[PDB]
């Protein structure tokens, strides 16, 4: 009865289905896109109730074989709320934990940045961009001082990492919001279906990246609103845009 469900991002859900073809049982797993790191345990209809850190070792005629890793950290479906970004804000993501770290940015005055822990190839998921879900209207109606971490998820939803959670001392369940901007980025924001965070975005490399290299992404603000007037972006970004284009000739 083993059924494998691969998401477009490369992650998967795997396990014996119920008499009704649902992903419900005590030996179900979510497997990250590395096809190695897994969250193994209790799921109900594809939803993670208690997944323990595991390693997918081999598969035999469709059936996977996991080794349960040491430690006692459990994970569960824990979608953010308006009163709660996460039930366990200081419980890091284990896949992300292996691939990235936060340190001072190499970009001048840019604050903290996100760095690779390891050498990876192109097309590699590195970090997750979880946050509270809000509307584009609320975001457009407020000061930029509040919109440093807003990321458009879909047409209807914006993911945000509001104060205090933009600090690792308060939130480290995901680290996507720590990656700084570049017009020549080594990463892109891409869709991701996460078993703990739900549908969010991730940071995926565009090219090979070495260990201790800073991860950057194109923030992609609108450079030419219908509006009459020029890019709707924070001032620091407008300055960098001017400087970058001076290396291009406009």
């Amino acid at each position: 009865g083993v059924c494998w469900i691969y998401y477009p991002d490369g992650g998967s859900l795997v396990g014996e289905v119920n008499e009704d073809g649902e992903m419900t049982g005590e030996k179900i797993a979510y497997v990250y896109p590395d096809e190695r790191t897994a969250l193994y345990g209790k799921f109900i209809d594809g939803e993670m109730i208690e997944g323990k850190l595991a390693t997918l070792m081999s598969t035999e005629e469709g059936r996977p074989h996991f080794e349960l890793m040491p430690g006692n950290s459990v994970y569960h479906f824990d979608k953010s709320t308006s009163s709660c970004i996460s039930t366990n804000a200081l419980l890091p993501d284990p896949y992300e934990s292996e691939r990235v770290y936060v340190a001072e940015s190499l970009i001048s005055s840019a604050g903290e940045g996100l760095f690779s822990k390891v050498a990876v190839g192109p097309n590699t998921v590195m970090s997750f961009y979880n946050g509270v879900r809000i509307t584009h209207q609320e975001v457009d109606s407020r000061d930029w001082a509040l919109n440093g971490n807003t990321l458009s998820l879909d047409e209807e939803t914006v993911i945000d990492v509001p104060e205090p959670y933009n600090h690792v001392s308060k939130y480290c369940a995901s680290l996507g919001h720590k990656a700084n901007h570049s017009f020549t980025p080594n990463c892109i924001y891409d869709m991701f279906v996460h078993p703990r965070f739900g549908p969010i975005k991730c940071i995926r490399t565009l090219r090979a990246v070495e260990a201790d290299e800073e991860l950057t992404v194109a923030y992609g603000y609108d450079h030419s609103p219908p509006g009459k007037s020029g890019p709707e972006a924070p001032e620091w970004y407008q300055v960098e845009l001017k400087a970058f284009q001076a290396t291009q000739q406009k």
């Binding site: 584009h136 975001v139 807003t150 990321l151 458009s152 047409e155």
Partner: peptide, 10 residues
């Protein structure tokens, strides 16, 4: 829109 990867208008 005041966010990243904001949707374009056509």
């Amino acid at each position: 829109a005041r966010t990243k990867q904001t949707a374009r208008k056509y």
